[PDB]
């Protein structure tokens, strides 16, 4: 079951989220525990780099903050549930097999 999966996230799990989180990324950032101030910093600091880079930076900051113990398949699954991205949750289930 995806929500109890304790596997540490690596590129293979993160890549579908990097590619598809898309323009509606900030609500998922809040569910991943970023404050509005932190979201604003990412939004401003990576404006010239583009939306995909804002997404990349947000996800990587989360993986770095939570570490190997905390940045897991099951925790990402819960975040995707909480931010209502069942499309992304489905891609995560498939890549985790």
Ligand X SMILES: *[C@@H]1O[C@H](CO)[C@@H](O)[C@H](O)[C@H]1NC(C)=O
Chain positions contacting ligand X, by CB under 6 A: 30, 35-36
Alpha-carbon distance of 62 to 70, in angstroms, equals 9
In the complex, which residue's CB is closest to ligand X? 36
Q: Please state the closest distance from residue 35 (CB atom) to ligand X, in A.
A: 4
Q: Please state the closest distance from residue 36 (CB atom) to ligand X, in A.
A: 3
Closer CB to ligand X, residue 43 or residue 91?
43
Closer CB to ligand X, residue 36 or residue 60?
36
Q: Tokens 């540490």 — which residue?
A: 8
| Nearest of 63, 59, 60 to residue 7 by alpha carbon | 63
Closer CB to ligand X, residue 36 or residue 84?
36
Closer CB to ligand X, residue 10 or residue 84?
84
Alpha-carbon distance of 47 to 94, in angstroms, equals 32
Q: Which two tokens stand for residue 1?
A: 């079951």
Q: Please state the closest distance from residue 5 (CB atom) to ligand X, in A.
A: 26
37 class by beta-carbon count within 10 Å (0-12 exposed, 13-18 middle, 19+ buried): exposed
């Amino acid at each position: 079951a995806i929500f109890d999966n304790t596997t540490s996230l690596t590129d293979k799990h993160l890549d579908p989220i990097r590619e598809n989180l898309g323009k509606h990324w900030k609500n998922c950032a809040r569910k991943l525990g970023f404050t509005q101030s932190q979201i604003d910093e990412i939004d401003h600091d990576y404006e010239r780099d583009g939306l995909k880079e804002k997404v990349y930076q947000m996800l990587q900051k989360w993986v770095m903050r939570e570490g190997i113990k905390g940045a897991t398949v099951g925790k990402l699954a819960q975040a995707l549930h909480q931010c209502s991205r069942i499309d992304l949750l489905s891609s995560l289930i498939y890549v985790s097999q």
